[PDB]
Amino acid sequence: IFQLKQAFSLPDIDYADISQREQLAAALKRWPLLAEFAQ
Amino acid sequence: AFSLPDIDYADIEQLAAALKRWPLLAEFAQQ
Amino acid sequence: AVLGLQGVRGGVGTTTITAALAWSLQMLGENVLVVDACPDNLLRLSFNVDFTHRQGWARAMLDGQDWRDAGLRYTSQLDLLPFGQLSIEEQENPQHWQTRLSDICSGLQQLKASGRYQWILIDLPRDASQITHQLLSLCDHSLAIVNVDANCHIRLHQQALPDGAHILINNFRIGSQVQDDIYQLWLQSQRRLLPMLIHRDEAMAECLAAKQPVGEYRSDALAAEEILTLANWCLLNYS
Amino acid sequence: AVLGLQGVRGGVGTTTITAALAWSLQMLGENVLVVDACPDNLLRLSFNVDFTHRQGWARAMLDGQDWRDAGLRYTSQLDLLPFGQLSIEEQENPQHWQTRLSDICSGLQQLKASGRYQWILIDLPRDASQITHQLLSLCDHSLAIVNVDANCHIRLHQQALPDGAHILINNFRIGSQVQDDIYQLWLQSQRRLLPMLIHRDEAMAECLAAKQPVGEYRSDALAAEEILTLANWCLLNYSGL
Ligand SMILES: Nc1ncnc2c1ncn2[C@@H]1O[C@H](COP(=O)(O)OP(=O)(O)OP(=O)(O)O)[C@@H](O)[C@H]1O
Ligand SMILES: Nc1ncnc2c1ncn2[C@@H]1O[C@H](COP(=O)(O)OP(=O)(O)OP(=O)(O)O)[C@@H](O)[C@H]1O
Ligand SMILES: [Mg+2]
Ligand SMILES: [Mg+2]
């Protein structure tokens, strides 16, 4: 919260619905960086 | 210890076609 | 409306997009003021401003002059306010002047209240200086510019963005499997991702070398069409 | 030898080249320390450091702790000094901490004098803060990393680089007419350009996603061979103090 007041927040990210798409499961399998943030 | 990069456009070599092509490039060359 | 454009990191295309989005808004019949808040002072070069032209809003303030006399008219619908050229000493000592520029917020507040322009686009640098946070507070909406790569993917999990900011992809390219994996992951997880993106496009690389916004340089360029889609989205959602 | 790496602008590939170069130097038999001076704290991720791991030299100092204990060992000849994770509050207040970190220079000037490492690589951010200029003073040599585009072309005409720096092209690729024009112009006018460049390479894009330097990730990639050529150039030309 910067002081008019400007607030700052982390980007809205939701990983709950990953396991649905099989293509996303293979991408998380190959790249450990993406799997690290996902789980 | 900070200075500008060493650049010389003393003689310009098909760069003449490039300088006529891009006004941004000819701007720094003639300067 | 006051719209801020800020890269999640440097070099993602914020300045080129700002100039292009301003051109597209004009083509849609809007009055636009473009403000360069970056000390690099590069935005002016997309508008055929001579490189030796040192005037700007910050250049004026630091010289004890009226910042309102440093603006330029590009078309009848598009005005430009460059940052101004800093000396090498000023570039390497930002703490000397990053606190002397608080009057621009008051000045832009008056301009906003007057309704003189329908759109004010602010090209914001990738830092957390006092002046950058002050201009962000004037914005009604903000666009966070990213490229689809591992660097930006990490930053979206650790650095803060302006509240309500939407994420805009630039430089989407053919020939990268890892980019496509990250992008498909973003399509399912990034809640604030915009539904359109900008591809890597030769016209976006050439228009700066021709010192024009991409829509003026090549009106039928694919990137020019992608920016026009963004301008139409801003008209509907950021009014 | 203390080598600083700094982008002429952000996103040109500074961090990836630093991690790749440190891997090539330890491949050539050198003991290497790599230091992240960027508050983004991204260099650690090229060496399989967990994202939740907050420890770093800056994070330790700001928490009243010893920075020497924030180091990590990747191989027996390559050590890592992450910056540490800044809180959101610290990130948006750079003046608060960019002045309290001057002690790292004496802690590194001592390490430079001990000689435990043949190469100390510093990943330097694109700003003009006090700690950045101080670390730049500790460097024996420096690389200014660019991409071939109009933005970097303008920056090379208006902003100051570290004195004695050499310019290193990254992400190069033939095909763009305007980029080829800029490249030919740089060859005939940029006096301090390096004789080798790093092509764009999907291995350079993938290695960070695999959390490895490009040389460990894919040793036969063109960019990995180009980084090895750079590492041999530093051994021949950047060895003196
Ligand atoms: N979509 C694109 N396709 C091709 N080239 C692009 C594209 N977007 C930007 N560029 C080029 O990339 C370079 C950097 O773009 P730009 O200056 O807009 O980025 P930036 O985020 O404002 O950079 P900086 O950190 O210097 O402010 C320029 O030379 C520009 O012409
Ligand atoms: N030669 C290359 N070919 C392809 N991709 C590359 C190349 N160099 C870097 N990249 C990619 O570009 C992105 C930015 O690289 P990097 O993080 O090294 O840049 P930087 O200059 O350190 O950025 P920052 O301003 O955040 O510190 C990464 O996703 C990286 O994988
Ligand atoms: Mg910019
Ligand atoms: Mg970096």
Coordinates of C-alpha atoms and ligand atoms in Angstrom, one line a residue:
Chain A
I1 CA 0.0 0.0 0.0
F2 CA 1.7 3.1 -1.3
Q3 CA 0.7 6.5 0.2
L4 CA -4.3 8.8 -3.2
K5 CA -3.3 5.2 -2.2
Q6 CA -2.0 2.6 -4.6
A7 CA -2.0 -1.0 -3.4
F8 CA 0.2 -3.9 -4.7
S9 CA -0.7 -7.6 -4.7
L10 CA 0.6 -10.8 -6.2
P11 CA -1.0 -11.9 -9.5
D12 CA -4.2 -14.0 -9.0
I13 CA -3.1 -17.5 -9.7
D14 CA -5.3 -20.6 -9.2
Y15 CA -3.8 -24.1 -9.8
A16 CA -6.8 -26.2 -8.6
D17 CA -7.9 -27.3 -12.1
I18 CA -4.6 -28.4 -13.5
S19 CA -5.1 -32.2 -13.3
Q20 CA -8.0 -32.0 -15.8
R21 CA -6.0 -31.4 -19.0
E22 CA -3.6 -34.3 -19.8
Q23 CA -1.4 -31.9 -21.9
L24 CA -0.8 -29.9 -18.8
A25 CA 0.2 -33.1 -16.9
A26 CA 2.9 -33.8 -19.5
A27 CA 4.2 -30.2 -19.4
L28 CA 4.5 -30.4 -15.6
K29 CA 6.3 -33.7 -16.0
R30 CA 9.0 -32.2 -18.3
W31 CA 9.6 -28.9 -16.6
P32 CA 10.4 -29.1 -12.9
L33 CA 10.1 -25.3 -12.5
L34 CA 6.4 -25.4 -13.6
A35 CA 5.7 -28.4 -11.3
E36 CA 7.3 -26.6 -8.4
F37 CA 4.9 -23.6 -8.5
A38 CA 1.9 -25.8 -9.4
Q39 CA 2.0 -28.1 -6.3
Chain B
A1 CA 34.0 4.9 -13.9
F2 CA 31.1 5.3 -16.4
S3 CA 31.4 6.5 -20.0
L4 CA 29.6 6.2 -23.3
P5 CA 30.4 3.3 -25.6
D6 CA 33.1 3.7 -28.2
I7 CA 31.4 4.3 -31.6
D8 CA 32.8 5.7 -34.8
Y9 CA 30.9 6.3 -38.1
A10 CA 34.0 7.7 -39.8
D11 CA 33.5 5.9 -43.1
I12 CA 30.3 4.1 -43.9
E13 CA 30.2 -1.1 -46.8
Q14 CA 26.6 -1.5 -47.8
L15 CA 25.5 0.3 -44.7
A16 CA 24.4 3.3 -46.9
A17 CA 21.4 1.2 -48.0
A18 CA 20.6 0.5 -44.3
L19 CA 21.0 4.2 -43.3
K20 CA 18.6 5.3 -46.0
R21 CA 16.2 2.5 -45.0
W22 CA 15.9 3.4 -41.3
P23 CA 15.8 7.1 -40.2
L24 CA 16.6 6.1 -36.7
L25 CA 19.9 4.6 -37.9
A26 CA 20.8 7.5 -40.1
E27 CA 20.1 9.9 -37.2
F28 CA 23.0 8.5 -35.1
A29 CA 25.3 8.1 -38.0
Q30 CA 25.2 11.7 -39.3
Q31 CA 25.3 13.0 -35.7
Chain C
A1 CA -9.4 7.1 -18.6
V2 CA -5.8 7.0 -17.3
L3 CA -4.1 3.7 -18.3
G4 CA -0.7 2.6 -17.1
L5 CA 1.5 0.2 -19.0
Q6 CA 4.3 -1.4 -17.1
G7 CA 6.5 -4.4 -17.9
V8 CA 6.8 -7.2 -15.4
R9 CA 10.4 -7.0 -16.5
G10 CA 12.4 -4.8 -18.9
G11 CA 12.5 -5.3 -22.6
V12 CA 9.1 -7.0 -22.9
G13 CA 7.8 -4.3 -25.3
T14 CA 6.0 -1.8 -23.0
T15 CA 7.1 1.3 -24.9
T16 CA 6.3 -0.1 -28.4
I17 CA 2.9 -1.2 -27.2
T18 CA 2.2 2.1 -25.6
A19 CA 2.9 4.1 -28.8
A20 CA 0.9 1.5 -30.8
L21 CA -2.1 1.5 -28.5
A22 CA -2.2 5.3 -28.6
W23 CA -2.2 5.2 -32.4
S24 CA -5.0 2.6 -32.4
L25 CA -7.2 4.6 -30.0
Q26 CA -6.9 7.7 -32.3
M27 CA -7.9 5.5 -35.2
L28 CA -11.0 4.6 -33.2
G29 CA -11.8 8.4 -32.8
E30 CA -10.3 9.1 -29.4
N31 CA -8.2 11.9 -28.0
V32 CA -5.0 10.5 -26.4
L33 CA -2.1 11.9 -24.4
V34 CA 1.0 9.7 -24.1
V35 CA 3.3 10.3 -21.2
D36 CA 6.8 8.9 -21.0
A37 CA 7.5 8.2 -17.3
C38 CA 10.7 6.2 -18.1
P39 CA 14.1 8.0 -17.6
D40 CA 15.3 6.2 -20.7
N41 CA 13.1 8.7 -22.6
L42 CA 12.6 6.3 -25.6
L43 CA 8.8 6.7 -26.2
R44 CA 9.4 10.0 -28.0
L45 CA 11.4 8.1 -30.7
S46 CA 8.3 6.3 -31.9
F47 CA 6.9 9.7 -32.8
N48 CA 9.6 11.2 -35.0
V49 CA 11.0 13.3 -32.2
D50 CA 14.7 14.2 -33.0
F51 CA 17.1 12.4 -30.7
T52 CA 18.8 15.7 -30.0
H53 CA 15.5 17.1 -28.7
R54 CA 16.1 17.0 -24.9
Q55 CA 12.9 18.7 -23.7
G56 CA 10.5 16.8 -21.5
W57 CA 8.3 17.0 -18.5
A58 CA 11.0 15.8 -16.1
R59 CA 13.7 17.8 -17.9
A60 CA 11.6 20.9 -17.4
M61 CA 10.9 20.3 -13.7
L62 CA 14.6 19.7 -12.9
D63 CA 15.5 22.9 -14.8
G64 CA 12.8 24.9 -12.9
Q65 CA 10.6 25.3 -15.9
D66 CA 6.9 24.6 -16.7
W67 CA 6.4 20.9 -17.6
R68 CA 3.3 21.9 -19.5
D69 CA 5.5 23.7 -22.1
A70 CA 7.4 20.4 -23.0
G71 CA 4.5 18.6 -24.6
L72 CA 4.3 17.9 -28.3
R73 CA 1.4 17.5 -30.7
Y74 CA 1.7 14.4 -33.0
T75 CA -1.7 14.5 -34.7
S76 CA -4.8 16.5 -33.8
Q77 CA -5.9 13.6 -31.7
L78 CA -2.6 12.5 -30.2
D79 CA -0.3 14.5 -27.9
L80 CA 3.1 13.4 -26.5
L81 CA 4.9 14.3 -23.3
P82 CA 8.4 13.0 -23.4
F83 CA 10.4 12.4 -20.2
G84 CA 13.4 14.5 -21.4
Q85 CA 17.0 13.7 -21.7
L86 CA 19.0 13.2 -18.5
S87 CA 22.8 13.8 -18.3
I88 CA 25.0 10.9 -17.5
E89 CA 25.5 12.2 -13.9
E90 CA 21.7 12.3 -13.5
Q91 CA 21.3 8.8 -15.0
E92 CA 23.7 7.3 -12.5
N93 CA 22.3 9.2 -9.5
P94 CA 18.5 8.6 -9.5
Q95 CA 18.2 9.5 -5.8
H96 CA 19.0 13.1 -6.6
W97 CA 15.9 13.7 -8.7
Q98 CA 13.4 10.8 -8.1
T99 CA 12.0 12.8 -5.2
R100 CA 12.0 16.3 -6.9
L101 CA 9.3 15.3 -9.4
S102 CA 6.2 15.0 -7.2
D103 CA 4.5 18.0 -9.0
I104 CA 3.8 15.9 -12.1
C105 CA 1.2 14.0 -10.1
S106 CA -0.7 17.2 -9.2
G107 CA -0.3 18.4 -12.8
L108 CA -1.6 15.2 -14.3
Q109 CA -4.5 15.3 -11.7
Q110 CA -5.6 18.6 -13.0
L111 CA -5.4 17.4 -16.6
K112 CA -7.4 14.3 -15.7
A113 CA -10.1 16.5 -14.0
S114 CA -10.3 18.8 -17.0
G115 CA -11.3 15.9 -19.3
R116 CA -9.1 17.5 -22.0
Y117 CA -8.1 14.0 -23.2
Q118 CA -10.3 10.9 -23.4
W119 CA -7.2 8.7 -22.7
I120 CA -4.0 9.2 -20.9
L121 CA -1.4 6.4 -21.4
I122 CA 1.5 6.3 -19.1
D123 CA 4.6 4.3 -20.1
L124 CA 6.0 3.3 -16.6
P125 CA 9.5 1.9 -15.9
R126 CA 10.3 -1.3 -14.2
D127 CA 11.2 0.0 -10.8
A128 CA 9.7 0.9 -7.5
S129 CA 10.7 4.5 -7.2
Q130 CA 8.6 7.2 -5.5
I131 CA 7.7 8.8 -8.8
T132 CA 6.7 5.5 -10.4
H133 CA 4.3 4.6 -7.5
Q134 CA 2.9 8.1 -7.6
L135 CA 2.0 7.9 -11.3
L136 CA 0.5 4.5 -10.8
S137 CA -1.8 5.9 -8.2
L138 CA -3.3 8.3 -10.8
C139 CA -4.1 5.3 -13.2
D140 CA -7.6 4.0 -13.4
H141 CA -6.4 0.8 -15.0
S142 CA -3.0 -0.8 -15.7
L143 CA -1.6 -3.4 -18.1
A144 CA 1.3 -5.6 -17.0
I145 CA 3.3 -6.5 -20.1
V146 CA 5.0 -10.0 -20.1
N147 CA 6.6 -12.4 -22.5
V148 CA 5.8 -16.1 -22.2
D149 CA 9.0 -17.5 -20.8
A150 CA 10.4 -19.0 -17.6
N151 CA 11.6 -15.6 -16.4
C152 CA 8.2 -13.9 -16.5
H153 CA 6.6 -17.1 -15.2
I154 CA 8.7 -16.9 -12.0
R155 CA 8.1 -13.2 -11.5
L156 CA 4.3 -13.7 -11.6
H157 CA 4.7 -15.8 -8.4
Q158 CA 6.9 -13.4 -6.4
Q159 CA 6.6 -9.7 -7.4
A160 CA 3.5 -7.6 -6.8
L161 CA 1.5 -5.9 -9.6
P162 CA -0.8 -2.9 -9.4
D163 CA -4.2 -3.9 -8.0
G164 CA -6.6 -4.9 -10.8
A165 CA -3.8 -5.0 -13.4
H166 CA -4.4 -7.3 -16.4
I167 CA -1.6 -9.2 -18.0
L168 CA -0.8 -8.7 -21.7
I169 CA 1.4 -11.1 -23.7
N170 CA 3.8 -9.7 -26.2
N171 CA 6.4 -11.4 -28.5
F172 CA 4.6 -14.7 -28.8
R173 CA 6.7 -16.7 -31.2
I174 CA 6.8 -19.9 -33.3
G175 CA 9.3 -22.6 -32.6
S176 CA 9.4 -22.8 -28.8
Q177 CA 8.0 -25.8 -27.0
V178 CA 8.7 -24.4 -23.5
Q179 CA 6.8 -21.2 -24.4
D180 CA 3.8 -23.3 -25.5
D181 CA 3.9 -25.3 -22.3
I182 CA 4.0 -22.2 -20.1
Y183 CA 1.2 -20.6 -22.2
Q184 CA -1.2 -23.5 -21.9
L185 CA -0.5 -23.5 -18.2
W186 CA -1.3 -19.8 -18.0
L187 CA -4.6 -20.3 -19.9
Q188 CA -5.8 -22.5 -17.0
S189 CA -4.2 -20.7 -14.0
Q190 CA -3.6 -17.0 -14.6
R191 CA -6.9 -15.5 -13.7
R192 CA -6.0 -12.0 -14.8
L193 CA -4.7 -12.9 -18.3
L194 CA -6.0 -10.9 -21.3
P195 CA -7.8 -12.9 -24.0
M196 CA -5.6 -11.5 -26.8
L197 CA -1.9 -11.4 -27.3
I198 CA 0.7 -9.8 -29.6
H199 CA 3.0 -12.0 -31.7
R200 CA 6.6 -11.4 -32.6
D201 CA 6.3 -9.4 -35.7
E202 CA 8.8 -7.7 -38.0
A203 CA 6.7 -4.6 -38.1
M204 CA 7.1 -4.1 -34.4
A205 CA 10.8 -4.4 -34.8
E206 CA 11.0 -2.0 -37.8
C207 CA 8.5 0.7 -36.7
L208 CA 10.9 1.9 -34.0
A209 CA 13.6 2.1 -36.6
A210 CA 11.2 4.2 -38.8
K211 CA 10.3 6.3 -35.7
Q212 CA 6.6 5.7 -36.1
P213 CA 3.9 3.7 -34.2
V214 CA 3.3 0.3 -35.7
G215 CA -0.2 1.2 -36.8
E216 CA 1.1 4.2 -38.8
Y217 CA 4.1 2.3 -40.1
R218 CA 2.2 -0.7 -41.5
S219 CA -1.5 -0.3 -41.0
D220 CA -2.2 -3.9 -42.2
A221 CA 0.6 -5.5 -40.2
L222 CA -0.7 -8.5 -38.2
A223 CA 0.7 -6.8 -35.0
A224 CA -1.2 -3.6 -35.9
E225 CA -4.4 -5.7 -36.1
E226 CA -3.6 -7.3 -32.7
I227 CA -3.1 -3.9 -31.1
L228 CA -6.4 -2.7 -32.6
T229 CA -8.1 -5.6 -30.9
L230 CA -6.5 -4.5 -27.6
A231 CA -7.7 -0.9 -28.2
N232 CA -11.2 -2.2 -28.8
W233 CA -11.0 -4.2 -25.5
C234 CA -9.9 -1.1 -23.6
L235 CA -12.8 0.9 -24.9
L236 CA -15.2 -1.7 -23.6
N237 CA -13.6 -2.5 -20.3
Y238 CA -11.3 0.3 -19.2
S239 CA -13.7 3.3 -19.9
Chain D
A1 CA 39.2 -12.4 -11.5
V2 CA 35.9 -10.6 -10.6
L3 CA 33.6 -10.4 -13.7
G4 CA 30.5 -8.3 -13.7
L5 CA 27.6 -9.1 -16.1
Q6 CA 25.0 -6.4 -16.7
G7 CA 22.3 -6.0 -19.3
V8 CA 22.2 -2.8 -21.2
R9 CA 18.5 -3.3 -20.6
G10 CA 16.4 -5.8 -18.8
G11 CA 15.5 -9.2 -20.3
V12 CA 18.5 -9.5 -22.7
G13 CA 19.7 -12.8 -21.1
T14 CA 22.1 -11.6 -18.4
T15 CA 21.2 -14.1 -15.7
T16 CA 21.1 -17.1 -18.1
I17 CA 24.5 -16.2 -19.5
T18 CA 25.9 -15.8 -16.0
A19 CA 24.8 -19.2 -14.9
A20 CA 25.9 -20.8 -18.2
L21 CA 29.3 -19.1 -18.1
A22 CA 29.9 -20.2 -14.5
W23 CA 29.1 -23.7 -15.5
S24 CA 31.5 -23.6 -18.4
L25 CA 34.3 -22.1 -16.3
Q26 CA 33.9 -24.9 -13.7
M27 CA 33.9 -27.3 -16.6
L28 CA 37.3 -26.0 -17.6
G29 CA 38.6 -26.7 -14.1
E30 CA 38.1 -23.4 -12.4
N31 CA 36.8 -22.8 -8.9
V32 CA 33.9 -20.4 -9.4
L33 CA 31.7 -18.3 -7.1
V34 CA 28.5 -16.9 -8.7
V35 CA 26.8 -14.0 -6.9
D36 CA 23.3 -12.7 -7.6
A37 CA 23.1 -8.9 -7.1
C38 CA 19.6 -8.7 -8.6
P39 CA 16.7 -8.3 -6.1
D40 CA 14.7 -10.5 -8.4
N41 CA 16.8 -13.4 -6.9
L42 CA 16.4 -15.4 -10.1
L43 CA 20.0 -16.8 -10.6
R44 CA 19.5 -19.4 -7.9
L45 CA 16.7 -21.1 -9.9
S46 CA 19.2 -22.1 -12.6
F47 CA 20.9 -24.2 -10.0
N48 CA 17.9 -26.2 -8.7
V49 CA 17.5 -24.1 -5.6
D50 CA 13.9 -24.4 -4.2
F51 CA 11.7 -21.4 -4.7
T52 CA 10.7 -21.5 -1.0
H53 CA 14.3 -21.2 0.0
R54 CA 14.5 -17.5 1.1
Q55 CA 18.1 -17.4 2.3
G56 CA 20.5 -15.1 0.6
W57 CA 23.3 -12.7 1.3
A58 CA 21.0 -9.7 1.2
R59 CA 18.2 -11.4 3.1
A60 CA 20.7 -12.4 5.8
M61 CA 22.1 -8.9 6.2
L62 CA 18.6 -7.3 6.4
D63 CA 17.7 -9.9 9.1
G64 CA 20.9 -9.2 11.1
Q65 CA 22.7 -12.4 10.2
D66 CA 26.0 -13.5 8.6
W67 CA 25.9 -13.4 4.8
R68 CA 28.7 -16.1 4.6
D69 CA 26.2 -18.8 5.8
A70 CA 23.8 -18.1 3.0
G71 CA 26.0 -19.7 0.4
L72 CA 25.2 -22.9 -1.4
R73 CA 27.4 -25.5 -3.1
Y74 CA 26.4 -26.7 -6.5
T75 CA 29.5 -28.7 -7.5
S76 CA 32.9 -29.0 -5.8
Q77 CA 34.1 -26.1 -8.1
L78 CA 31.0 -23.9 -8.3
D79 CA 29.4 -22.1 -5.3
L80 CA 26.2 -20.0 -5.3
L81 CA 25.4 -16.9 -3.4
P82 CA 21.7 -16.1 -3.9
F83 CA 20.3 -12.6 -3.2
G84 CA 17.5 -13.9 -1.0
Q85 CA 13.7 -13.4 -1.2
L86 CA 12.5 -9.9 -0.5
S87 CA 9.1 -9.4 1.0
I88 CA 6.5 -7.5 -1.0
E89 CA 7.0 -4.6 1.4
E90 CA 10.8 -4.6 0.9
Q91 CA 10.4 -4.8 -2.9
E92 CA 8.4 -1.6 -3.2
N93 CA 10.8 0.3 -0.9
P94 CA 14.2 0.0 -2.6
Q95 CA 15.7 3.0 -0.9
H96 CA 15.2 1.3 2.5
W97 CA 17.7 -1.5 1.8
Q98 CA 19.7 -0.3 -1.2
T99 CA 21.8 1.7 1.3
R100 CA 22.3 -0.9 4.1
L101 CA 24.2 -3.4 2.0
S102 CA 27.5 -1.7 1.5
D103 CA 29.3 -4.2 3.8
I104 CA 29.1 -6.9 1.1
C105 CA 31.9 -5.1 -0.8
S106 CA 34.4 -5.6 2.1
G107 CA 33.2 -9.2 2.5
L108 CA 33.8 -9.8 -1.2
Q109 CA 37.1 -7.8 -1.4
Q110 CA 38.4 -10.1 1.3
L111 CA 37.2 -13.1 -0.7
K112 CA 38.8 -11.7 -3.8
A113 CA 42.1 -11.4 -1.8
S114 CA 41.9 -14.9 -0.3
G115 CA 42.0 -16.5 -3.7
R116 CA 39.7 -19.4 -2.9
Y117 CA 38.1 -18.8 -6.3
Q118 CA 39.6 -18.2 -9.7
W119 CA 36.4 -16.5 -11.0
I120 CA 33.8 -14.5 -9.1
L121 CA 30.8 -13.8 -11.4
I122 CA 28.3 -11.1 -10.3
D123 CA 24.9 -10.9 -12.0
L124 CA 24.2 -7.2 -11.8
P125 CA 20.8 -5.6 -12.2
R126 CA 19.8 -2.9 -14.6
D127 CA 19.7 0.1 -12.3
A128 CA 22.0 2.7 -10.9
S129 CA 21.6 2.0 -7.1
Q130 CA 24.4 2.5 -4.7
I131 CA 25.0 -1.3 -4.1
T132 CA 25.1 -1.8 -7.9
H133 CA 27.8 0.8 -8.5
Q134 CA 29.7 -0.5 -5.5
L135 CA 29.8 -4.1 -6.7
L136 CA 30.7 -2.8 -10.2
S137 CA 33.8 -1.2 -8.6
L138 CA 34.8 -4.6 -7.2
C139 CA 34.8 -6.1 -10.7
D140 CA 38.1 -6.5 -12.7
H141 CA 36.2 -6.8 -16.0
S142 CA 32.6 -6.5 -17.1
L143 CA 30.3 -7.6 -20.0
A144 CA 27.5 -5.5 -21.3
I145 CA 24.9 -7.8 -22.7
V146 CA 22.7 -6.6 -25.6
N147 CA 20.2 -7.9 -28.1
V148 CA 20.3 -6.8 -31.7
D149 CA 17.3 -4.4 -31.9
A150 CA 16.6 -0.7 -32.2
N151 CA 16.1 -0.3 -28.4
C152 CA 19.6 -1.4 -27.6
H153 CA 20.9 0.6 -30.6
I154 CA 19.5 3.8 -29.0
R155 CA 20.7 2.8 -25.5
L156 CA 24.3 2.3 -26.8
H157 CA 24.2 6.0 -27.9
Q158 CA 22.8 7.6 -24.8
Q159 CA 23.5 5.6 -21.6
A160 CA 26.8 4.9 -19.9
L161 CA 28.3 1.4 -19.7
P162 CA 30.9 0.3 -17.1
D163 CA 34.3 1.5 -18.2
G164 CA 36.4 -1.1 -20.0
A165 CA 33.3 -3.3 -20.6
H166 CA 32.9 -5.4 -23.7
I167 CA 29.6 -5.8 -25.5
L168 CA 28.2 -9.3 -25.9
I169 CA 25.3 -10.1 -28.3
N170 CA 22.7 -12.6 -27.1
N171 CA 19.6 -14.0 -28.7
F172 CA 20.9 -13.4 -32.2
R173 CA 19.2 -14.9 -35.2
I174 CA 19.4 -14.1 -38.9
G175 CA 16.2 -13.3 -40.8
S176 CA 15.0 -9.9 -39.6
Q177 CA 15.9 -7.3 -42.1
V178 CA 16.1 -4.4 -39.6
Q179 CA 18.1 -6.6 -37.1
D180 CA 20.6 -7.6 -39.8
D181 CA 21.0 -3.9 -40.8
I182 CA 21.7 -3.0 -37.1
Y183 CA 24.1 -6.0 -36.8
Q184 CA 26.1 -5.0 -39.9
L185 CA 26.2 -1.4 -38.6
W186 CA 27.5 -2.6 -35.2
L187 CA 30.2 -4.7 -36.8
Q188 CA 31.7 -1.6 -38.5
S189 CA 31.1 1.0 -35.7
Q190 CA 31.0 -0.7 -32.2
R191 CA 34.6 -0.7 -31.2
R192 CA 34.2 -2.8 -28.1
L193 CA 32.0 -5.6 -29.6
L194 CA 33.1 -9.2 -28.7
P195 CA 34.2 -11.4 -31.6
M196 CA 31.6 -14.1 -30.6
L197 CA 27.9 -13.9 -29.9
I198 CA 25.2 -16.2 -28.5
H199 CA 22.5 -17.3 -31.0
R200 CA 18.9 -17.7 -29.9
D201 CA 18.5 -21.3 -28.8
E202 CA 15.6 -23.2 -27.3
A203 CA 18.1 -24.8 -24.9
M204 CA 18.6 -21.3 -23.4
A205 CA 14.8 -21.0 -23.0
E206 CA 14.4 -24.5 -21.6
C207 CA 17.3 -24.7 -19.2
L208 CA 15.8 -22.3 -16.7
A209 CA 12.5 -24.3 -16.8
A210 CA 14.7 -27.4 -16.1
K211 CA 16.5 -25.4 -13.4
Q212 CA 20.0 -26.1 -14.9
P213 CA 22.6 -24.1 -16.7
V214 CA 22.5 -24.5 -20.4
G215 CA 25.7 -26.5 -20.5
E216 CA 24.5 -29.1 -18.0
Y217 CA 21.1 -29.2 -19.6
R218 CA 22.3 -29.8 -23.2
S219 CA 26.0 -29.8 -23.7
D220 CA 25.8 -30.1 -27.5
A221 CA 23.6 -27.1 -28.0
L222 CA 24.9 -24.3 -30.2
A223 CA 24.5 -21.8 -27.4
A224 CA 26.4 -24.1 -25.0
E225 CA 29.2 -24.3 -27.4
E226 CA 29.1 -20.5 -27.8
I227 CA 29.2 -20.0 -24.0
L228 CA 32.3 -22.4 -23.9
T229 CA 33.9 -20.2 -26.5
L230 CA 33.2 -17.2 -24.3
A231 CA 34.6 -19.0 -21.2
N232 CA 37.9 -19.7 -23.2
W233 CA 38.0 -16.0 -24.2
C234 CA 37.7 -14.9 -20.5
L235 CA 40.6 -17.3 -19.5
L236 CA 42.8 -15.8 -22.2
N237 CA 41.8 -12.1 -21.9
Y238 CA 40.0 -11.5 -18.5
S239 CA 42.4 -13.3 -16.2
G240 CA 44.4 -10.3 -15.0
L241 CA 43.3 -8.3 -12.0
Ligands
LIG1 N1 6.1 -7.9 -30.8 C1 7.4 -7.5 -31.2 N2 7.9 -8.1 -32.3 C2 9.2 -7.7 -32.6 N3 10.0 -6.8 -32.0 C3 9.4 -6.3 -31.0 C4 8.1 -6.6 -30.5 N4 7.8 -5.8 -29.3 C5 8.9 -5.1 -29.2 N5 9.9 -5.3 -30.1 C6 11.2 -4.7 -30.2 O1 11.9 -5.0 -29.0 C7 12.7 -3.9 -28.5 C8 12.2 -3.6 -27.1 O2 10.9 -3.1 -27.2 P1 10.4 -1.9 -26.2 O3 11.4 -0.8 -26.2 O4 9.0 -1.5 -26.6 O5 10.4 -2.6 -24.8 P2 10.4 -2.1 -23.3 O6 9.8 -3.1 -22.4 O7 9.8 -0.7 -23.3 O8 12.0 -1.9 -23.0 P3 12.7 -1.1 -22.0 O9 13.1 -1.9 -20.8 O10 14.0 -0.5 -22.6 O11 11.8 0.1 -21.6 C9 12.5 -2.8 -29.5 O12 13.6 -2.7 -30.4 C10 11.2 -3.1 -30.2 O13 11.2 -2.7 -31.6
LIG2 N1 19.9 -17.0 -26.3 C1 18.7 -17.2 -25.9 N2 17.8 -17.9 -26.6 C2 16.6 -18.1 -26.2 N3 16.0 -17.7 -25.1 C3 16.9 -17.0 -24.3 C4 18.2 -16.7 -24.6 N4 18.8 -16.0 -23.6 C5 17.8 -15.9 -22.7 N5 16.6 -16.5 -23.1 C6 15.4 -16.5 -22.3 O1 15.0 -15.2 -22.2 C7 14.4 -15.0 -20.8 C8 15.1 -13.9 -20.1 O2 16.5 -14.3 -19.8 P1 17.2 -13.9 -18.5 O3 16.4 -14.1 -17.3 O4 18.6 -14.5 -18.5 O5 17.4 -12.3 -18.8 P2 17.8 -11.1 -17.9 O6 18.5 -10.0 -18.7 O7 18.6 -11.6 -16.7 O8 16.4 -10.6 -17.3 P3 16.0 -9.7 -16.1 O9 15.9 -8.3 -16.5 O10 14.7 -10.3 -15.4 O11 17.1 -9.9 -15.0 C9 14.5 -16.4 -20.2 O12 13.2 -17.0 -20.3 C10 15.6 -17.1 -20.9 O13 15.4 -18.5 -20.9
MG3 MG 10.3 1.0 -22.4
MG4 MG 18.5 -11.3 -14.6

